[PDB]
Scaffold this active site. Structure first.
Site, mmCIF file in Angstrom:
data_model
loop_
_atom_site.group_PDB
_atom_site.id
_atom_site.type_symbol
_atom_site.label_atom_id
_atom_site.label_comp_id
_atom_site.label_asym_id
_atom_site.label_seq_id
_atom_site.Cartn_x
_atom_site.Cartn_y
_atom_site.Cartn_z
ATOM 1 N N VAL A 41 0.835 -1.344 0.251
ATOM 2 C CA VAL A 41 0.016 0.001 0.032
ATOM 3 C C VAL A 41 0.685 1.465 0.068
ATOM 4 O O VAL A 41 2.140 1.221 0.322
ATOM 5 C CB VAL A 41 -0.911 -0.185 0.909
ATOM 6 C CG1 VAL A 41 -0.221 0.205 2.486
ATOM 7 C CG2 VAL A 41 -2.119 1.096 0.950
ATOM 8 N N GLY A 42 0.207 2.306 -0.244
ATOM 9 C CA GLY A 42 0.987 3.804 -0.174
ATOM 10 C C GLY A 42 1.813 4.018 -1.493
ATOM 11 O O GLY A 42 2.051 5.139 -1.770
ATOM 12 N N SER A 43 2.035 2.911 -2.387
ATOM 13 C CA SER A 43 2.851 3.135 -3.491
ATOM 14 C C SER A 43 4.114 3.534 -3.059
ATOM 15 O O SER A 43 4.916 4.181 -3.638
ATOM 16 C CB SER A 43 2.476 4.124 -4.707
ATOM 17 O OG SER A 43 0.970 3.802 -4.932
ATOM 18 N N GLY B 112 7.011 4.942 2.745
ATOM 19 C CA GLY B 112 7.872 3.789 3.241
ATOM 20 C C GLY B 112 7.562 2.449 2.532
ATOM 21 O O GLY B 112 6.632 2.367 1.864
ATOM 22 N N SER B 113 8.167 1.454 2.785
ATOM 23 C CA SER B 113 7.708 0.317 2.520
ATOM 24 C C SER B 113 6.571 -0.228 3.459
ATOM 25 O O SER B 113 6.807 -0.842 4.501
ATOM 26 C CB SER B 113 8.907 -0.974 2.428
ATOM 27 O OG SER B 113 8.462 -1.974 1.825
ATOM 28 N N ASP C 5 1.972 10.887 11.665
ATOM 29 C CA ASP C 5 3.554 11.245 11.165
ATOM 30 C C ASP C 5 4.193 12.463 11.598
ATOM 31 O O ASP C 5 4.130 13.566 11.050
ATOM 32 C CB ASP C 5 3.240 11.563 9.414
ATOM 33 C CG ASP C 5 2.775 10.147 8.618
ATOM 34 O OD1 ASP C 5 3.268 9.169 9.133
ATOM 35 O OD2 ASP C 5 2.094 10.304 7.765
HETATM 36 N N1 3IP Z 1 -1.643 3.705 9.466
HETATM 37 C C1 3IP Z 1 -1.397 3.758 8.085
HETATM 38 N N2 3IP Z 1 -2.493 3.653 7.159
HETATM 39 C C2 3IP Z 1 -2.349 3.655 5.679
HETATM 40 C C3 3IP Z 1 -1.086 3.689 4.914
HETATM 41 C C4 3IP Z 1 0.130 3.728 5.980
HETATM 42 C C5 3IP Z 1 -0.033 3.726 7.338
HETATM 43 O O1 3IP Z 1 0.958 3.751 8.297
HETATM 44 C C6 3IP Z 1 2.574 3.479 8.126
HETATM 45 C C7 3IP Z 1 3.087 3.382 9.256
HETATM 46 C C8 3IP Z 1 3.045 1.864 10.180
HETATM 47 C C9 3IP Z 1 3.875 1.748 11.370
HETATM 48 C C10 3IP Z 1 4.473 2.857 11.980
HETATM 49 C C11 3IP Z 1 4.597 4.248 11.427
HETATM 50 C C12 3IP Z 1 4.001 4.650 10.052
#
Ligand code: 3IP
Length: 351
Positions: free
Chosen positions: A27-29, A33-34, A165
């Site tokens: 997800v996210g493309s 991040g991965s 974030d």
């Molecule tokens: N919570 C999310 N929902 C959709 C796409 C990406 C997401 O978060 C990424 C993430 C995971 C674990 C720790 C920090 C960020």
């Protein structure tokens, strides 16, 4: 004690995760991040699982990794992203190389939801209320988010909101350059680096967001740093001598003084038709001198939020030890610190 892991390759990389997590789907493309979406069979929760890339490749990267893990482990509040789980397939420190993090799967952010559109006043009340509620919590631990914008705010079907974030890695100059959303919500003192900043920068961001929810338009969509400063000063007025003193850069202080002086505008004629209580709150958030802005705790008791305010249900955080930020360590020392936090993790109660 240790769960069973399984491997698979996805679009990229070997993922190795506990059996409890099923149906991994990229997800996210790669924008986050991965990241894969999954179903956690132990909790019934839909989750996002992030695999950190080269977490310990340098001193600066080892510290970043530690920083993000510390922060995610601390935060426990309805209106803030928390940590559901953290794991590594490694059996010892010696073989420790990969870090995975797990949080609630978020669907819509406020950005790709309210794109180009006004909300009703009650929805603005409720959305801003929750941001300020999470922010009272964040600020009480002396944590500054630093990078609040619509795209870092997640909202579900029932209008419920979480802050996501945090500012964990300083932006490059290039991403802050030009006609970009990355800069439009930033307090002037940190955009031009006038002085040492503090938590009040986040309150400036909230005002920018609140205005945008009311009008459907970006408040300060500058084509660059200087265009954006002119848009700001036209609304709130040029600095008086009291504020000029507090700007410790001589060059910046000197540039500000080259500008023709302007008075603060009438907000009621800017935000035409808006609840007078909303206008009042905007004036108290969007103040140039950061010492004089309203705080999150003060804003929560503002009459605009009379519908939602509950002083017995606006909790503060446990103290957060940030001493490590001043600390200078080797790669392997940061890594050993990180391993300890992974190993000591206790999951939240499902209730
Ligand atoms: N919570 C999310 N929902 C959709 C796409 C990406 C997401 O978060 C990424 C993430 C995971 C674990 C720790 C920090 C960020």
């Amino acid at each position: 004690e240790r769960p069973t892991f399984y491997r698979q390759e996805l679009n990229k990389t070997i993922w190795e995760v506990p059996e409890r997590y099923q149906n991994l789907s990229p997800v996210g493309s790669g924008a986050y991040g991965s990241v894969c979406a999954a179903f956690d069979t132990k909790t019934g929760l839909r989750v996002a699982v992030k695999k950190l890339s080269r977490p310990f490749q340098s001193i600066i990267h080892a510290k970043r990794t530690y920083r993000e893990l510390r922060l995610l482990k601390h935060m426990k509040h309805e209106n803030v992203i928390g940590l559901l789980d953290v794991f590594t397939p490694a059996r010892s420190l010696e073989e420790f190389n990969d870090v995975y993090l797990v949080t609630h799967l978020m669907g819509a952010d406020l950005n790709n939801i309210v794109k180009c559109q006004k909300l009703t006043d009650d929805h603005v009340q409720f959305l801003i209320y929750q941001i300020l509620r999470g922010l009272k919590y964040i600020h009480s631990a002396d944590i500054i988010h630093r990078d609040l914008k619509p795209s870092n705010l997640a909202v579900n079907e029932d209008c419920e909101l979480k802050i996501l974030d945090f500012g964990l890695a300083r932006h490059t100059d290039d991403e802050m350059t030009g006609y970009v959303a990355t800069r439009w919500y930033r307090a002037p003192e940190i955009m031009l680096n006038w002085m040492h900043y503090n938590q009040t920068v986040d309150i400036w961001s909230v005002g920018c967001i609140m205005a945008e929810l009311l009008t459907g338009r970006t408040l300060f969509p500058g084509t660059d740093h200087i265009d954006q400063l002119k848009l700001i000063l036209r609304l709130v007025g040029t600095p008086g001598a009291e504020l000029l003193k507090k700007i410790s850069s001589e060059s910046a202080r000197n540039y500000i003084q080259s500008l023709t002086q302007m008075p603060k505008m009438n907000f009621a004629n800017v935000f035409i038709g808006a609840n007078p209580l909303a206008v009042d709150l905007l004036e108290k958030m969007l103040v140039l001198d950061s010492d004089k802005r309203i705080t999150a705790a003060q804003a929560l008791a503002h009459a605009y939020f009379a519908q939602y305010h509950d002083p017995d249900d606006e909790p503060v955080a446990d103290p957060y030890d940030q001493s490590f930020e001043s600390r200078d360590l080797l790669i392997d020392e940061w890594k050993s610190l990180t391993y300890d936090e992974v190993i000591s993790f206790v999951p939240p109660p499902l209730d």
